[PDB]
Short mmCIF file of C-alpha atoms in Angstrom, two decimals:
data_model
loop_
_atom_site.label_atom_id
_atom_site.label_comp_id
_atom_site.label_asym_id
_atom_site.label_seq_id
_atom_site.Cartn_x
_atom_site.Cartn_y
_atom_site.Cartn_z
CA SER A 1 -24.49 67.86 -0.33
CA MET A 2 -22.07 67.55 2.56
CA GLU A 3 -24.99 68.48 4.95
CA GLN A 4 -26.63 65.01 4.02
CA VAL A 5 -23.20 63.24 4.66
CA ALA A 6 -22.98 64.76 8.23
CA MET A 7 -26.61 63.78 8.77
CA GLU A 8 -25.84 60.14 7.81
CA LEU A 9 -22.69 60.17 9.94
CA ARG A 10 -25.15 60.81 12.89
CA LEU A 11 -27.77 58.18 11.67
CA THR A 12 -25.03 55.60 11.11
CA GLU A 13 -23.87 56.24 14.76
CA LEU A 14 -27.39 56.05 16.06
CA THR A 15 -27.61 52.71 14.27
CA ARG A 16 -24.26 51.81 15.85
CA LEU A 17 -25.57 52.82 19.39
CA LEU A 18 -28.93 51.13 18.83
CA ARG A 19 -27.09 47.83 17.73
CA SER A 20 -25.48 47.67 21.12
CA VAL A 21 -28.75 48.42 22.95
CA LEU A 22 -30.60 45.84 21.21
CA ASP A 23 -27.96 43.30 22.09
CA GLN A 24 -28.39 44.08 25.87
CA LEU A 25 -32.25 43.95 25.71
CA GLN A 26 -32.03 40.61 23.89
CA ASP A 27 -29.58 39.23 26.55
CA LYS A 28 -32.51 39.68 29.11
CA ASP A 29 -34.41 36.95 27.03
CA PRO A 30 -32.13 33.91 27.49
CA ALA A 31 -35.17 31.60 26.80
CA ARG A 32 -35.45 33.32 23.33
CA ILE A 33 -39.31 33.63 23.62
CA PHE A 34 -39.01 37.10 21.90
CA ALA A 35 -36.31 36.14 19.22
CA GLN A 36 -38.58 35.43 16.36
CA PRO A 37 -42.01 36.47 15.16
CA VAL A 38 -44.97 34.49 16.48
CA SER A 39 -45.54 31.68 13.90
CA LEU A 40 -48.68 32.16 11.91
CA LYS A 41 -48.46 28.52 10.87
CA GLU A 42 -48.57 27.58 14.69
CA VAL A 43 -50.96 30.41 15.74
CA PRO A 44 -53.21 30.94 12.60
CA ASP A 45 -55.54 33.35 14.41
CA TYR A 46 -52.72 35.45 15.98
CA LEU A 47 -53.60 38.66 13.94
CA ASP A 48 -57.20 38.50 15.13
CA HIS A 49 -55.58 39.22 18.44
CA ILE A 50 -52.58 41.40 17.81
CA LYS A 51 -52.47 43.95 15.12
CA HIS A 52 -48.80 45.02 15.31
CA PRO A 53 -46.71 41.92 15.99
CA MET A 54 -43.03 42.62 16.95
CA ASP A 55 -40.03 40.47 17.78
CA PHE A 56 -36.24 41.02 18.14
CA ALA A 57 -35.15 39.63 14.63
CA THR A 58 -37.77 41.97 13.10
CA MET A 59 -36.30 45.04 15.07
CA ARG A 60 -32.80 43.89 13.82
CA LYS A 61 -33.83 43.78 10.06
CA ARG A 62 -35.09 47.42 10.63
CA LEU A 63 -31.97 48.35 12.56
CA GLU A 64 -29.59 47.25 9.81
CA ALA A 65 -31.81 48.93 7.31
CA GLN A 66 -31.22 52.22 9.30
CA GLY A 67 -34.97 52.50 9.76
CA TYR A 68 -35.02 54.00 13.37
CA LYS A 69 -34.89 57.86 13.14
CA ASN A 70 -34.53 58.16 16.96
CA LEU A 71 -34.51 56.30 20.22
CA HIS A 72 -38.29 56.85 20.61
CA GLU A 73 -39.28 54.71 17.44
CA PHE A 74 -36.91 51.95 18.81
CA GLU A 75 -38.42 52.00 22.25
CA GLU A 76 -41.89 51.69 20.60
CA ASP A 77 -40.94 48.41 18.92
CA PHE A 78 -39.60 47.05 22.25
CA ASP A 79 -42.84 47.90 24.08
CA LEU A 80 -44.90 46.22 21.37
CA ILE A 81 -43.09 42.99 22.04
CA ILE A 82 -43.82 43.25 25.76
CA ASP A 83 -47.42 44.63 25.52
CA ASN A 84 -48.56 42.06 22.72
CA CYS A 85 -47.35 39.17 24.83
CA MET A 86 -48.97 40.45 28.03
CA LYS A 87 -52.30 40.61 26.02
CA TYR A 88 -52.08 37.36 24.14
CA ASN A 89 -50.84 35.30 27.07
CA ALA A 90 -52.62 34.83 30.34
CA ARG A 91 -51.01 35.95 33.60
CA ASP A 92 -50.02 32.53 34.89
CA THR A 93 -48.00 31.58 31.80
CA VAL A 94 -44.25 31.31 31.16
CA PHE A 95 -44.53 33.78 28.38
CA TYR A 96 -46.51 36.56 30.23
CA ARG A 97 -43.89 36.13 33.03
CA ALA A 98 -40.95 36.40 30.66
CA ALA A 99 -42.28 39.79 29.38
CA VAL A 100 -42.59 41.08 32.89
CA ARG A 101 -38.99 40.22 33.53
CA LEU A 102 -37.88 41.73 30.21
CA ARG A 103 -39.70 44.92 30.87
CA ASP A 104 -38.06 45.22 34.25
CA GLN A 105 -34.54 44.48 33.27
CA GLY A 106 -34.87 46.57 30.09
CA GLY A 107 -35.81 49.65 32.22
CA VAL A 108 -32.20 49.91 33.27
CA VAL A 109 -30.68 49.61 29.83
CA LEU A 110 -33.26 52.05 28.39
CA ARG A 111 -32.65 54.51 31.18
CA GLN A 112 -29.00 54.82 30.24
CA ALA A 113 -29.57 54.76 26.57
CA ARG A 114 -31.88 57.91 26.94
CA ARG A 115 -28.94 59.68 28.68
CA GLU A 116 -26.41 58.39 25.88
CA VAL A 117 -28.51 59.67 22.95
CA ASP A 118 -29.26 63.10 24.67
CA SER A 119 -25.51 63.32 25.76
CA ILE A 120 -23.77 62.37 22.53
CA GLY A 121 -26.59 64.00 20.37
#
């Protein structure tokens, strides 16, 4: 059908808008602490701590596979990154402090992305 093509023309554009937003969120991580998944070779017991690991390249695979149906699923993956980090790492660590900054600076980017998805549909 043509009603599945118009559907995909939206999804493709959501994917296009989300690609931009991920780029901005990831620019708030110049240290690249959230670029890659936590290494299981380097933290063998990590899944004993964190059940749903998340990182930017993992969100990227999913993005280019058009696996985000809406902003809300995308936002959930972003909060995983932050929230996992704040649990696994103690408060007086470079990693906990980088998450707090990422969270603060990503508020602004996400605040405008909510308006652009509502606005443009």
